[PDB]
Amino acid sequence: GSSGSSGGSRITYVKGDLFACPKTDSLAHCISEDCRMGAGIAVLFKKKFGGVQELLNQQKKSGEVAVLKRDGRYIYYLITKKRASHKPTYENLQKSLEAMKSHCLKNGVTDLSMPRIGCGLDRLQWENVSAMIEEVFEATDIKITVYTL
């Protein structure tokens, strides 16, 4: 008869659509510097807005995050690797998250939604990432949700 409530673990998992579910929540994911959006979920995104030409115009790089105003939300693009040839690193990832959140506060985005990130079994491991989001957002006022369909 006790509601399991523990510190941190502000990450919540939801079942169902990820773009049709949220009405105001923005989208956030990791991509390559060469906007090589052609693998995993990253593909859908390229189809939803497919603004590679708009993103590239930002000339972003590792540790930096890109922003795009589609209609009424700011889409973030975490950059960790430069090209498919280059595998993603945890070090960069963390930073990317710090650069992304920085925006939310700057403006006022207390709502974010991002799918499952961490392709490959050896490459990366959600267990690790999910943790980075805790330490990075450990001291913030932004709510995040992870959709799994």
UniProtKB/Swiss-Prot annotation:
GO terms for molecular function: ADP-ribosyl-[dinitrogen reductase] hydrolase activity; ADP-ribosylglutamate hydrolase activity; O-acetyl-ADP-ribose deacetylase activity; purine nucleoside binding. The gene is OARD1. Substrate binds at L18, R116, I117, G118, C119, G120, L121, D122, L149. Pfam families: Macro. Subject to competitive inhibition by the product ADP-ribose. Ubiquitous. GO terms for cellular component: nucleolus; nucleoplasm; site of DNA damage. It is an enzyme of class 3 (hydrolase). Gene3D superfamilies: Leucine Aminopeptidase, subunit E, domain 1 (3.40.220.10). Changing H29A: Abolishes enzyme activity. Keywords: Acetylation, Chromosome, Disease variant, Hydrolase, Nucleus, Phosphoprotein. InterPro entries: ADP-ribose_metab_enzymes, Macro_dom, Macro_dom-like. The keyword Nucleus applies. This is ADP-ribose glycohydrolase OARD1. Its EC number is 3.5.1.-, 3.2.2.-. It catalyses: 2''-O-acetyl-ADP-D-ribose + H2O = ADP-D-ribose + acetate + H(+); 5-O-(ADP-D-ribosyl)-L-glutamyl-[protein] + H2O = L-glutamyl-[protein] + ADP-D-ribose + H(+); alpha-NAD(+) + H2O = ADP-D-ribose + nicotinamide + H(+). PANTHER family: ADP-RIBOSE GLYCOHYDROLASE OARD1, PROTEIN C6ORF130. The active site is at K81 (nucleophile), D122 (proton acceptor).
